[PDB]
User: Fold this.
Amino acid sequence: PKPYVAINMAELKNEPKTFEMFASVGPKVCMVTARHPGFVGFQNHWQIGILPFGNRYGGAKMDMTKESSTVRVLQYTFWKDWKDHEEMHRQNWSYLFRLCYSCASQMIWGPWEPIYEIIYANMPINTEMTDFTAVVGKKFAEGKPLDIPVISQPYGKRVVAFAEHSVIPGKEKQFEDAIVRTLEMLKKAPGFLGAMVLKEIGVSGIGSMQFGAKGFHQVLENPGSLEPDPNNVMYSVPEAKNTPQQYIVHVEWANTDALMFGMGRVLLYPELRQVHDEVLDTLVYGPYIRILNPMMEGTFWREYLNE
Amino acid sequence: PKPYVAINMAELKNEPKTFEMFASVGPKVCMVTARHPGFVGFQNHWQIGILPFGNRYGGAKMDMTKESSTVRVLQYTFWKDWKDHEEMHRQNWSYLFRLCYSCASQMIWGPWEPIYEIIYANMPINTEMTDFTAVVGKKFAEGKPLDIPVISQPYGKRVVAFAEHSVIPGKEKQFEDAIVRTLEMLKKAPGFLGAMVLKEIGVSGIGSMQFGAKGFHQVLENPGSLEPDPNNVMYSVPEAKNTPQQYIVHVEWANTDALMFGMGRVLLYPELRQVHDEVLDTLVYGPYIRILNPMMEGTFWREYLNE
Amino acid sequence: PKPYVAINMAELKNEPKTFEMFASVGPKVCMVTARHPGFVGFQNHWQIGILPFGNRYGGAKMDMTKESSTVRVLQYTFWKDWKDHEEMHRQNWSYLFRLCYSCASQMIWGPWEPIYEIIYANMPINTEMTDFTAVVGKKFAEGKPLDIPVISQPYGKRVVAFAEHSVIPGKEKQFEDAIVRTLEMLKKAPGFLGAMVLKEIGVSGIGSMQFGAKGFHQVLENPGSLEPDPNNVMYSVPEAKNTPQQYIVHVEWANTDALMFGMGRVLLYPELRQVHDEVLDTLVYGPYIRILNPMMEGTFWREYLNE
Amino acid sequence: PKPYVAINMAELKNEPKTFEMFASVGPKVCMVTARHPGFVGFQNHWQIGILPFGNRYGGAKMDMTKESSTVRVLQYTFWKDWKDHEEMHRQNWSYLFRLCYSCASQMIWGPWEPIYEIIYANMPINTEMTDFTAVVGKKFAEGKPLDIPVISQPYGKRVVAFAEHSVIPGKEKQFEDAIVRTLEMLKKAPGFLGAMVLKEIGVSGIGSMQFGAKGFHQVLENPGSLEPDPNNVMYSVPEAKNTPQQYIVHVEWANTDALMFGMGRVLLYPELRQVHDEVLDTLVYGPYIRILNPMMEGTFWREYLNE
Ligand SMILES: [Fe+3]
Ligand SMILES: [Fe+3]
Ligand SMILES: [Fe+3]
Ligand SMILES: [Fe+3]
Assistant:
């Protein structure tokens, strides 16, 4: 079935100490999150650059890692019910806060953790290049050659287009209908590895370290080993849902060239351009497209998705 | 059928002279071992690092070869009957001892050669990337597409997780049942190339250069061209079997990222975590996981295994 | 009386940060251990090298500290009853775990903490070179000149031969009789500072950070300030006792030359060689001899020993 | 059908000028050879090294190109009838001599051009990694999945073991029977790309620039633009056939590791070792194994071979 998605977002200093700290803290956080039976996996991203749209963002390029002073992380966790995410954080708060707070020394902005529902998904299981022979053999043995997927390689061996959209109130249905038609046509582009549309349903205050006064002071004063009061979150997840409605169009690609020209198919192929124009007519903001590297991931979230 | 496994273990200086000596002496030892008809192949490993488990072993990394002052070798030989290994050593002692003793100038610890029975094996034949087209065609022509394996590349083009376990006396059946259930579920991870469970049955004194007093002095005094008395081994293979019972869980992977996150599936995927927890409850020691490079190998041992 | 000995073993990166951490954390751990009235002292060792036995381990030398990428520690704590060690760990768990876990960032292997009984001891009190005049005067005034010991200098000013043995099941009495006869003759070598024979009685799971599943996850997920459940150790100390039976022959020497040629007396002096040959005939493994520097120590453990 | 093979052999200075002239002269010679309708293709090799057989040739390694002062070339041309090669040389002598003579400035030894019959061949068509999808589709459409070959990549993207043998007079039948059995078993080795056995039938005097006195002086005196008398070759091809009988066992491999351990299967796998021992018992010389890079080739010779 379709899981819910929590996306923990933050900006940190782009230096080895940041990546060293992620190598030790990151796995621990994932192991704590896996204590909850509603956890179905994760996909953690480093932003490597920004899609320039020709020279609309002429100061950007798809890989800015050599020049950038910061690194943005977008850490997806997948949940049977979005309430499982909230329960997990509270049930494991003493571990989670102390682990997550240990990254504060590198932090420039965040954490900010919106929660999303998946309204469309065309996402395959990941396979390494070593696996495809057995996948093909099994699918043919089952008489299901149409179920043979593209090779979507895990652990940093593909790239993600993370396309931010906000929609004019009252045009959500037009946006959703047109973006699904767009993605159904986009899958013909070479190197397309899958797409999904995420629709924001709210924000996790506890995952964003957004408390009332009491917890705010406890966060600011923390030596690192004392939990803020997890009951001092002042709003539920849906209370923080944004209007204009926010969406993420998440598209995976074999490499950054396939991403650039593949996403570009909505501008360059006349039939698709007419369809995608219906998306553009509904927007308050966007599309703004971040280029992401999916490095650490728990690939079994796609097994839950595809049943 | 399942062969027995002898694993010759040693630690040597990490310097070019060590790898030069292995390039010339190593093949000679393998050729002598192949004189016995019970020999069914071999798989020789260099340890490249240690799995850090987040930062549980924070001084370790999966590839420590650039910094390490030593190199550990784990040389598997496969036998129709473990007694064939003992007979081979004695029948060819003048060659084997003089070849193996020539390594002494580089040696820091070893040799130590435990013997194992295989209690579980899910291991494919090795294939190079050039081979899969013919393998696929042959299996389909035979009507056995389910027998098409993953591509497990020989000669250093994959990695091994070598997981050491010792088990509380009386919990061996619980360990064995649970680890098999774990490995049957682990094979869904991307880049999984196979697994087997080795259970120690004893130690080869002659393969470990472990003699009584007479042979000990002959080893220490040796100019290099005089054999110690091979009859001066004071214990049979089973007499040295350890209690607590020792196991090796040997899992092969496409690359070190697939290894790290694939092995991590027993921690990150809740359903598998519950199964693997039954393994953890039985342990005196472990899991301690060495990262191995299978460089020199006689791949036909898997043909014997898979018949 | 003879205390029991717990030996905490670990391997860490050989870099200044490791020795800095030991200079601050080490004393803290010792002070916590001293909270228990059954604690009678300690003797902490750095391995400086390996005895090469001519060129049997030709890649080794007695001092490998300049080249080695790792450092092995062997931390002896002495106890009136071995159960005191287990009680101390649990009574002081919140301090001990957090202190010991702070070493994890430097750790490659360990901790592993076997427990031993002393079956033979000929070990003097330590004295500095400044002390011997008062020791001599006191012993003569008491009419006990035979109780004047050799000068065994504390705090890194002597060396230890740490000789590992494992014994064929059924040959333990032969080993023990012969090694005692050997050590009674070895004390004639110049620079001999004492010897003792340690016989393994089990392993401390809590001291080895070896828990069931619950504690294992708590260790891996730990931010550093949360204790694993100390009741989640799944085995008692005796349940982990190894067969083949393990022994440590611990011999102290004025310097590494006295060690090399003094230990060599069991090979070079014919009458002693015949006696020590009876030891060699009983072995599954060994002798493998580590060269240790006893740097930080609580010398009063020898006062308890010698009453 | 099986073509005949002419192998032009020479040794030249290992310097850029040699490879420059080969980049210009080599294609011209091949274009001239293709003027004859009996020409069915070619496969030109650079020797990159020598198989050391452990340390039997301890001064050798499989890739000596960085240290070698010379480069050996082995240029295979394939012919419907070996007489076609002789006719081609004479019909096109003014071009061929002047082209081939232009390499003399770099030459140390050669040219020497023995002629061979193929007595056994298991050689696939070459395919690039881009081609295999269409090859698989075509073979399944023909209902012949057993005809799907391994991927044997052209133009320097595989390696050749060139194994020289000379056979005791009267043992030719034993050699030929046993080598065919050996190669039929060797094809199980990973990365095996094909094998063929070439049996010398004679030597091309004209291709070897081996004339009588008249042509010898014309070669030595040549300014580069005057042909020696092509009728001054004093021996026919069969008149130069060697006794002891010479063979080449030509085996192709995915890479040099697959070659080393794959060819080693005749020494390391007991069942194959027994078969290959029947080859060894017949030899005057060899096996001596050159490691070759097949760079420039006309791959259609395998289309002729395979019908
Ligand atoms: Fe969260
Ligand atoms: Fe052996
Ligand atoms: Fe302890
Ligand atoms: Fe020719």
Summary: The two ends of chain B are 7 Å apart (CA to CA). The pocket of fe (iii) ion (ligand 4) is lined by residues D 6, 8, 77, 85, 89, 113, 204, 207 (CB under 6 Å). The longest strand of chain B covers residues 283-298.
